[PDB]
């Protein structure tokens, strides 16, 4: 699960 979550991009400002 961690690798999948770790690929998420934060939202831009």
């Amino acid at each position: 699960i961690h690798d999948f979550v770790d690929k998420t991009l934060p939202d831009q400002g």
Partner: antibody, heavy 115, light 113 residues
Framework: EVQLLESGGGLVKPGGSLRLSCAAS????????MNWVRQPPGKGLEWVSS????????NYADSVKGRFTISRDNAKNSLYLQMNSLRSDDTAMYYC????????WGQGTLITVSS | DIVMTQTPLSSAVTLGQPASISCRSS???????????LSWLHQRPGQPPRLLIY???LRFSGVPDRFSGSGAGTDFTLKISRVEAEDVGIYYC?????????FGGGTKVEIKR
């Protein structure tokens, strides 16, 4: 296992420049955002810059915008930070880190900006 | 920008007893995908930070279950159900929900012996 290792730090004069590198292995590099985070002496962690897996999205902390440039070479499994117009208060341990969770970090490299 | 206000600055805990660290976000911490991306890290002197909890409440591999995270909206908490001697050091929250990425100011845990 995942490995990240920074190089290119050291001592530089105010106004000078340095280029940091981070070599990665153990994961599919172009699938992850990569980041630079710094820790000034005696202070907490502070985000510096991020770059998405294929360089589409690049972000900088306001305090480094216009002076630092992040880039990556996916074929070389490498992340870079070009640091220009350095100031004494850029002195810090600089870490590369993978992704958005903070799970994988390099060992850090010290940048000292001093006369 | 999302400011993470982390309290307390330091906490002294008897061996085996619980500890709690709070981080409050300046605005509701919610990603466009509906989730909340906040991690808790532990750093020892001369070492990189180590991940304990990610996505608010998920434990990173190798982290013992005495560590847990929770929270929603603006209030997030790291709990240590029973402190051990090796838990000394500085803990940070980190939000990676929205740029700029931001950290709490840290909490130093001390063991009282």
């Amino acid at each position: 296992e995942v490995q990240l290792l920074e190089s290119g730090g050291g001592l530089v004069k105010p106004g000078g420049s340095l280029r940091l590198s981070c070599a990665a292995s153990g994961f599919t590099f172009n699938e992850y955002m990569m980041n630079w985070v710094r820790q000034p002496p005696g202070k907490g962690l502070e985000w510096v810059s991020s770059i998405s897996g294929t360089s589409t999205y690049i972000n900088y902390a306001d305090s480094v915008k216009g002076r630092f440039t992040i880039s990556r070479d996916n074929a070389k499994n490498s992340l870079y930070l070009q640091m220009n117009s350095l100031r004494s208060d850029d002195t810090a341990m600089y870490y590369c880190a993978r992704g958005s969770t903070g799970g994988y970090w390099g060992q850090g490299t010290l940048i000292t900006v001093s006369s | 920008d999302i400011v993470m206000t982390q309290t307390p600055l330091s906490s002294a805990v008897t061996l085996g007893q619980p500890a709690s660290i709070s981080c409050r976000s300046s605005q509701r911490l919610v990603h466009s995908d509906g989730n909340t991306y906040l991690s808790w890290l532990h750093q020892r002197p001369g070492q990189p930070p180590r991940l304990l909890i990610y996505k608010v409440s998920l434990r990173f591999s190798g982290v013992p279950d005495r560590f847990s995270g929770s929270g929603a909206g603006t209030d997030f908490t790291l709990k240590i159900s029973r402190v051990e001697a090796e838990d000394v050091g500085i803990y940070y929250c980190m939000q990676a929900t929205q740029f700029p990425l931001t950290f709490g100011g840290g909490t130093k845990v001390e063991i009282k012996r």
